Amino acid sequence: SALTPQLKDTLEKLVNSEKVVLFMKGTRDFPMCGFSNTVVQILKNLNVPFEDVNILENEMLRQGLKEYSNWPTFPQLYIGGEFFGGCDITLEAFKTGELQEEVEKAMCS
For residue 83, say whether it is annotated as part of any ligand binding site. Answer: no
For residue 52, say whether it is annotated as part of any ligand binding site. Answer: no
For residue 25, say whether it is annotated as part of any ligand binding site. Answer: yes
d(CA 27, CA 97): 25
For residue 74, say whether it is annotated as part of any ligand binding site. Answer: yes
For residue 87, say whether it is annotated as part of any ligand binding site. Answer: yes
With CA atoms as reference, report the closest residue to 14 among 88, 82, 106, 95: 82
Domains and CATH numbers, the chain: 10-106 (3.40.30.10)
For residue 30, say whether it is annotated as part of any ligand binding site. Answer: no
Resolution attained, angstroms: 2.4
The H or E element spanning position 71 is none
d(CA 58, CA 44): 25
CA 108-64-36 angle, to 5 degrees, is 60
Q: State the method.
A: X-ray
Burial class (CB in 10 A: 0-12, 13-18, 19+), 57: exposed
CA 21-90-48 angle, to 5 degrees, is 45
The H or E element spanning position 10 is helix 5-15
d(CA 4, CA 106): 28
For residue 28, say whether it is annotated as part of any ligand binding site. Answer: no
**HSE-up (13 A, CA, CB side) for residue 22:** 25
